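Researcher: Batch entry, complex prediction.
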Amino acid sequence: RLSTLIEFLLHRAYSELMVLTDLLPRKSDVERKIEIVQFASRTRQLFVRLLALVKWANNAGKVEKCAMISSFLDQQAILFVDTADRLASLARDALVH
Amino acid sequence: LSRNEIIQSYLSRQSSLLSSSARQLHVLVPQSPPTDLPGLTREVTQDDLDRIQASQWPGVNGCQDTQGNWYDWTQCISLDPHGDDGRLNILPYVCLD
Amino acid sequence: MADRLTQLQDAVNSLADQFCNAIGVLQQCGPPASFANPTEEYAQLFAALIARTAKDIDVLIDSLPSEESTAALQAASLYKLEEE
Amino acid sequence: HLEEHLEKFVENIRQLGIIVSDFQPSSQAGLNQKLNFIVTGLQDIDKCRQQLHDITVPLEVFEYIDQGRNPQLYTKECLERALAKNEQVKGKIDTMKKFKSLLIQELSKVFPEDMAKYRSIR
Amino acid sequence: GPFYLMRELPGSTELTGSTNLITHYNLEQAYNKFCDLPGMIDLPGSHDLRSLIEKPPILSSGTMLAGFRLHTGPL
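Model: Structure tokens for the complex:
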């Protein structure tokens, strides 16, 4: 899923840069430098959060195993409650009649 | 169903024990190979009817006991199968009127 | 009502109810783990109650009538009682 | 892997570009924008490399990144919830063990011969 | 003799929830390690609105031409 997010991030970055380059000659150049460094801050934040993602990409498989563990233990808890539930449905419904 | 709490669990305890309840148990009765219509097949006689009317027959006319006390079907038996103060009270088997 | 038989029926139903209550208590509530004391007290009390119910059911079973007094012994006694 | 170092060089070039365009540079500073466009092209090559890599990531990573922490904290929390569920389940099974032991003790008290035959059969 | 409807109990210790699931699942050393990357990445860069828009795009999911059309003056 990170490939799709990487492509979409690169696309949105290139498109916003295209809009910035289109307004670059249009904008007043002195304040346009300020708008350029604001856009550079935008791109730096996008890229550093992608850097955090590709850092965590080593730690992805352990979280996959943790999700497996959590699903398994939730299943066994539902087994305990289902056993108690079916015993209650025995003791209060079928034996009374 | 969702939650059981000290007071509610103790309510369950007293309700279940008041529904349910040195040995003082009934004298054990063995298996009976002579039964009158199917097993032994006695042609209708007279000793059996006189025993069922007048004498003590511990499988037919009553429930006998340790400490000797005889109880026929219309009486209620007080016993203590545990080593506690709580007494089992077998209700009468017939309850005439 | 008010028979040894209805007492035995209610005792057997109380046994089934104590089964469902014992599992539903001792699975829903417990101390977490280590790789509480009220729960241990609950377990002891539930085990004692189940044992007492079993003993009571056994005593009531001993109390009812035997497999002597078949229906023909009842019927012939009924006939003699009609004559007398 | 390589996408990390490529995007890191891209981010450092973006920072140097912001520094240079922050300055009143009389010389050519269009090289900064050209290097930014070339970094976008190399990021497209890295997107081809991400089609090669095929990483699947849950959303709570994105959200904890939005909170600005480490995603290592999310790893710690997933590990902690795994141990929490394992602790709870082992505890429930341990109480069932103690309850079975108590029940066979009390039934062996009240019914000797039957629990004797049960301990024989197991 | 035999009680009514006795049967065979399952295999003595199969997979349960009473085992140590993590040590069986080879995840022990990661936990023993583990028990900001904004700060660990600000080891590389300066610091860590439109970054809210970065996170919102995260929650939502011609280079020579740009350099040629990037005409803007210095002062």
